[model samples]
Target chain A: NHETFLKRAVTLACEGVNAGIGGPFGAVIVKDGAIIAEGQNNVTTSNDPTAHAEVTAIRKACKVLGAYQLDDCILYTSCEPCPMCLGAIYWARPKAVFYAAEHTDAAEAGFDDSFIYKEIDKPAEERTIPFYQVTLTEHLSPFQAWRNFANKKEY
Target chain B: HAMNHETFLKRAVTLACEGVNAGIGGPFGAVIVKDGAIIAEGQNNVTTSNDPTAHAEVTAIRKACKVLGAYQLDDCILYTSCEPCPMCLGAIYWARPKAVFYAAEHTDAAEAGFDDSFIYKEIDKPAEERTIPFYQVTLTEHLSPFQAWRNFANKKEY
Candidate 1:
């Protein structure tokens, strides 16, 4: 059940980044395969990008879990997290696990290849850290979930 | 000062990718123009093989001529991103396009360093047998040689 929840959280992170309004971000604090606390990053403004916000949401979820120090937490987003967001998560010192369903504009623009979900497990001495690149071959719109959310709101 | 045709063809392909990665923004279509008309041309984008040699320029005059929509060319200038490659020059030679000019630097330092293995394999064959040409451009002004060296060193081994 916790694994399922974590997977869902990763999906949310992807949507958040694509929508350009703060996240489809997701995070949950787990101990013994049980979710302690979970939250999705809230969208603030329509024009806001969620890459950073989704990461902040993860940090928030950790705090809610009463985690004084996190050993590792699995985080997921739809696009490769920007260096800024990656650096922020790194600063928290928790092992960050992330996944993205599609490549971001930056990655495409930069002609980066490779996609998967993995740990940012690298020592500080290595300036270039190991990261996983994940590609979502199936096409899915960014608003797919939000549409569902809107329908529920209408009812 | 005569090198084999293959040398020029290979150089054209490498430099084409290098130009695009360096921020010259194209999956561009290039042509060597001599006497104000196309002698040879090639498209910068490659197909399934991520190699620059797969780019149209590597096949020399035949490929370039096909790309340029011409059957023949002579005595013209070559134009691509900003800096045309020597291989491209050679390809033009086969097509008979004269001199070359480019719009930007041939490589993007950020992305260029990652593709060294590809570079090494493609360029490693004997110069005459190879399909492209190699011209050493100074990368120091845009990036430190140390940085370039480090990038080649950091590649993931399969």
Candidate 2:
């Protein structure tokens, strides 16, 4: 349900701020009421740029599943997936994907949203997937708060 | 006065204190090392990310993998303040570092903050299949002024 993992993802996102991600975004994957995996951004001054929320959760979820795939799971992120994350979702192939922000909103803030919808057009890597995209705004304010507080230095 | 690895764990305790003071969460700190070189370090601060996955070990692992340039934790060692929770354990499994080291037992870390457990028993789950080694450096508690004799109320379990 939209009401479920959306909160989970938002909570993670706010925690992402606490965990020190400049973007303060978080994500999670769930199946049948259980959180298969939860992740926060890892771009803290203490971490690396590679630990994006969606991909990190996907990696953890894969380990927990132990040879199982995301077949029936729903993936949720605090913000929209970028081209890199679209590639991950394609490989992971979850039942659906939910996000709180759009590519434009994220890009407007100087985050590397990477223009997935356009970049994946027929002229490019040409990606396609049968997954639902969901919008969640119930917890957007906290993420904005984190964004407002973040300086180039560590939080 | 030089601290070395044989000292079990040095900076970890202070870093654990660092996390707690910073309101990171649970008194935990972590560092990933390779070839006696410090790759990256982290301290747990729950509010630092408001995410359950913000534990120190995973954060350390993430940074070290970036330094390695392949996300390969194959030849590295993970040094952490407390025993891991199921989430951080899963992070360790995903990162696949050669081994893990810790100061407190699973109960201590789980009890210290956020009540996350299952690691103590999971460590008992067949090392051959459990992915990596878990080295319990118990003396770390005695070695640090931070954890030593301070919290008689909670650290007795350490």
Candidate 3:
């Protein structure tokens, strides 16, 4: 059912995969299977550390929706949202959050950072919207500019 | 030797706040001027292109150059709220903007929360070896409002 959204999320994620050290991540918002807005990681571009693809895309979609609430929509990210992003979802109030990679998977991608997110289990239980991990693995490696920079990377 | 320049620098900070509000991870504002006339301006480092390389300086430069009907910027000045990080510095160097007027340094804007460790290598280089390939004047000034924003922003990880 989410087949198309899944592919687009990956494409959006690919767009964030900067060959530079910070990472390239992307996210999108969809309602009725149509994209409302999209965004990607931009430490290199924007220099904001918390500018996760999901965060950027959601905020812009809110502007597009012209409302604070993201009614009748689903949020998707290339990887699991970081602690800050997970918290952002609570306030943004998406119907659900779909992710392809897990936090541990993204650990290599930059998961080891300043803030520590509270476990999602209890929050998920209390959250008005639902959250789901639909993919089998972390899919952001191919987009890493590492191989080209590493020899083939750092932030 | 010109108008206090603080007005223009703070204007750059205001421009950057728009970038911050625009949701481009690193909210920044940039303007290009040649001979006292603004050529073009833009906010945010990231655009709909979704490429992280779409920084404010780069975008503004592209817009200014494309619209001005030519590319050399040796007589122009680019103003940004915060200092340009390594990548943007590369863009500034490549574009050859004559001067850069900025508000805060990397230390001040670490509020964006990204690890800007890469900037150290660029700044630590000897001036002679500085990757800045062009002769230029970089006028840096203190913008109290900007300083307050940075201090406030650094209070939390957002």
Best prediction by lDDT? 2
Judging by TM-score against the true structure, name the best candidate. 2
lDDT of 1 by residue, A85-145 (tens): 3332332333443433333332333312121111112321231221111122211111122
CAPRI classification of candidate 1: incorrect
DockQ of 2: 0.03
Candidate 3 stretches with Cα past 4 Å from truth are A1-155, B1-3, B122-158
Report the lDDT tens digits of candidate 2 across residue range A1-155: 65567666766665545433434567888888788898876644434444667867886887777532466878877666654454345435576777665556555544545433332232211322111111222112222222344331121
| Top candidate (DockQ) | 2
Q: Model 1: per-residue lDDT, tens digit, B1-158?
A: 55432333334444444434443222333444444444555554322222222223333344544554453343444454323232332223223343444333334311332222333243334422422321122111212211222344332111
Off by over 4 Å in 1: A1-6, A10-29, A37-43, A46-53, A66-68, A102-155, B1-158
Candidate 3's TM-score reads 0.38
Worst 10 residues of 2 chain B by lDDT: B134-143
Off by over 4 Å in 2: A1-155, B1-8, B118-158
* Candidate 3 local lDDT, A12-46, one digit each (tens): 55433423312445677898888999876654344
C-alpha DockQ of every model: 0.02, 0.03, 0.02
- Using lDDT as the yardstick, the better of models 1 and 2 is 2
Q: What C-alpha lDDT, on a 0 to 100 scale, does residue A43 get in candidate 2?
A: 44
Interface RMSD in Å per candidate, to 1 decimal?
24.4, 24.4, 24.4
Ranking by DockQ: 2, 3, 1
Error of 2 at A121 (Å): 47
